[PDB]
Design an enzyme around this catalytic site. Sequence first.
Site, PDB file in Angstrom:
ATOM      1  CG  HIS A  65      -1.680  -1.324   1.366  1.00 44.19           C
ATOM      2  ND1 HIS A  65      -2.767  -1.666   0.403  1.00 44.19           N
ATOM      3  CD2 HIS A  65      -1.695  -2.078   2.495  1.00 44.19           C
ATOM      4  CE1 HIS A  65      -3.214  -2.761   1.019  1.00 44.19           C
ATOM      5  NE2 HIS A  65      -2.384  -3.186   2.189  1.00 44.19           N
ATOM      6  CG  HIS A  95       3.194   5.820   5.656  1.00 49.98           C
ATOM      7  ND1 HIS A  95       2.943   5.757   6.815  1.00 49.98           N
ATOM      8  CD2 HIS A  95       2.129   6.321   5.177  1.00 49.98           C
ATOM      9  CE1 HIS A  95       1.687   6.171   7.307  1.00 49.98           C
ATOM     10  NE2 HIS A  95       1.003   6.609   6.191  1.00 49.98           N
ATOM     11  CG  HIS A  97      -0.711   8.676   1.739  1.00 50.97           C
ATOM     12  ND1 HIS A  97      -1.490   7.415   1.665  1.00 50.97           N
ATOM     13  CD2 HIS A  97      -0.302   8.671   3.142  1.00 50.97           C
ATOM     14  CE1 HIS A  97      -1.511   6.809   3.040  1.00 50.97           C
ATOM     15  NE2 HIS A  97      -0.895   7.669   3.761  1.00 50.97           N
ATOM     16  CD  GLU A 107      -3.769   9.615   2.622  1.00 51.86           C
ATOM     17  OE1 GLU A 107      -3.592   9.606   3.807  1.00 51.86           O
ATOM     18  OE2 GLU A 107      -4.405   8.384   2.015  1.00 51.86           O
ATOM     19  CG  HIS A 120       0.563  10.315   6.927  1.00 50.59           C
ATOM     20  ND1 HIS A 120      -0.362   9.771   5.979  1.00 50.59           N
ATOM     21  CD2 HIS A 120       0.501  11.793   6.621  1.00 50.59           C
ATOM     22  CE1 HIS A 120      -1.373  10.408   5.514  1.00 50.59           C
ATOM     23  NE2 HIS A 120      -0.970  11.908   5.981  1.00 50.59           N
ATOM     24  CB  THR A 199      -5.836   8.022   5.535  1.00 53.12           C
ATOM     25  OG1 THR A 199      -4.573   7.568   5.166  1.00 53.12           O
ATOM     26  CG2 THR A 199      -5.863   9.377   6.274  1.00 53.12           C
ATOM     27  CB  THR A 200      -4.920   2.713   5.231  1.00 50.64           C
ATOM     28  OG1 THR A 200      -4.320   2.418   6.449  1.00 50.64           O
ATOM     29  CG2 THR A 200      -3.859   3.696   4.409  1.00 50.64           C
TER      30      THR A 200
HETATM   31  N1  LIG Z   1      -1.918   6.616   6.685  1.00 51.92           N
HETATM   32  S1  LIG Z   1      -2.060   6.889   8.231  1.00 51.92           S
HETATM   33  O1  LIG Z   1      -3.396   7.022   8.960  1.00 51.92           O
HETATM   34  O2  LIG Z   1      -0.962   7.570   8.551  1.00 51.92           O
HETATM   35  C1  LIG Z   1      -1.575   5.155   9.118  1.00 51.92           C
HETATM   36  C2  LIG Z   1      -1.050   5.132  10.507  1.00 51.92           C
HETATM   37  C3  LIG Z   1      -0.606   3.903  10.835  1.00 51.92           C
HETATM   38  C4  LIG Z   1      -0.622   2.774  10.061  1.00 51.92           C
HETATM   39  C5  LIG Z   1       0.181   1.578  10.545  1.00 51.92           C
HETATM   40  O3  LIG Z   1       1.477   1.844  11.012  1.00 51.92           O
HETATM   41  N2  LIG Z   1      -0.238   0.298  10.371  1.00 51.92           N
HETATM   42  C6  LIG Z   1       0.287  -1.106  10.688  1.00 51.92           C
HETATM   43  C7  LIG Z   1       0.615  -1.500   9.421  1.00 51.92           C
HETATM   44  C8  LIG Z   1      -0.564  -1.647   8.521  1.00 51.92           C
HETATM   45  C9  LIG Z   1      -0.530  -2.630   7.578  1.00 51.92           C
HETATM   46  C10 LIG Z   1      -1.886  -2.737   6.890  1.00 51.92           C
HETATM   47  O4  LIG Z   1      -2.134  -3.740   5.898  1.00 51.92           O
HETATM   48  C11 LIG Z   1      -2.983  -1.962   7.010  1.00 51.92           C
HETATM   49  O5  LIG Z   1      -4.222  -2.137   6.374  1.00 51.92           O
HETATM   50  C12 LIG Z   1      -2.990  -1.050   7.826  1.00 51.92           C
HETATM   51  C13 LIG Z   1      -1.768  -0.881   8.732  1.00 51.92           C
HETATM   52  C14 LIG Z   1      -1.712   0.224   9.722  1.00 51.92           C
HETATM   53  C15 LIG Z   1      -2.726  -0.484  10.908  1.00 51.92           C
HETATM   54  C16 LIG Z   1      -3.237   0.576  11.919  1.00 51.92           C
HETATM   55  C17 LIG Z   1      -4.006   0.290  12.982  1.00 51.92           C
HETATM   56  C18 LIG Z   1      -4.238  -1.193  13.089  1.00 51.92           C
HETATM   57  C19 LIG Z   1      -3.649  -2.067  12.548  1.00 51.92           C
HETATM   58  C20 LIG Z   1      -2.933  -1.590  11.152  1.00 51.92           C
HETATM   59  C21 LIG Z   1      -1.003   2.848   8.664  1.00 51.92           C
HETATM   60  C22 LIG Z   1      -1.465   4.223   8.187  1.00 51.92           C
HETATM   61 ZN   LIG Z   2      -0.682   7.853   5.574  1.00 52.60          ZN
END
Ligand SMILES: NS(=O)(=O)c1ccc(C(=O)N2CCc3cc(O)c(O)cc3[C@H]2c2ccccc2)cc1
Ligand SMILES: [Zn+2]
Length: 260
Positions: A65, A95, A97, A107, A120, A199-200
Amino acid sequence: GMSHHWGYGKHNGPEHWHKDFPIAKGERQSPVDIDTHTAKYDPSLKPLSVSYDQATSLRILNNGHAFNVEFDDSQDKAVLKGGPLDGTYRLIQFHFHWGSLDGQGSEHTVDKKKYAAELHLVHWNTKYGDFGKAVQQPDGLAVLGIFLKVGSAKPGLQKVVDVLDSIKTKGKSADFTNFDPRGLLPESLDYWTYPGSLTTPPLLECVTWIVLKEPISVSSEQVLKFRKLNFNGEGEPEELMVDNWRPAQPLKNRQIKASF
Ligand SMILES: NS(=O)(=O)c1ccc(C(=O)N2CCc3cc(O)c(O)cc3[C@H]2c2ccccc2)cc1
Ligand SMILES: [Zn+2]
């Protein structure tokens, strides 16, 4: 998440997320458009404190992603505090976007303006013990967002750009130690802040968003390298990793505050 199949394509993109993650239509979803004229200056907002002097990077990973530069968060090293935050938040990863074109990629938006990308820096509230427990709390995470515009190169980003060749596809990771995230910050720490979410997927509403007003500049060659990454894994049909951003969501019952 072994059964996750959401993405940024036409058949699994943001408009589909709600079917597996109903909170997608929640009351405090991110990102959002920042209306600079509606955001009100908050004199009570304390100055933001970014202490990355002891940051310890460990690895960089293409998760399908985006790519995450991960830090050692087993100790109180790189921390974010102050501003609208109460307590201490520890840096766990950062990371980006980005888009397929310089005219899109971020975003959050500013007066509907889209930036070429958005960084981010994710931090979790130490009072919850770990990242997994923190994401289950309304004030579990603090994400520092920084807009990227295309122009002059960002020296401090080049180390990231050059290692991307080694993690082209989903699941690939590479050693990435001694990287200083301070080289990715703009000069000013003026920011906007509001309560929101990841946001994901799982789109948990656990984030205090702090978005810096001043963008950083990256070169066309730098962002171009980002667009050469792949969403797919090795040996699979090549899908360029571009436009991995979620569009602005309804602000609803929220107010964006400005530190300036
Ligand atoms: N874009 S964001 O809102 O800044 C964001 C923040 C943290 C994370 C994050 O660190 N994780 C862990 C890795 C991960 C892997 C995935 O396939 C996924 O769908 C999400 C994430 C997110 C995550 C956040 C909270 C719970 C589980 C996973 C991701 C995105
Ligand atoms: Zn992000």
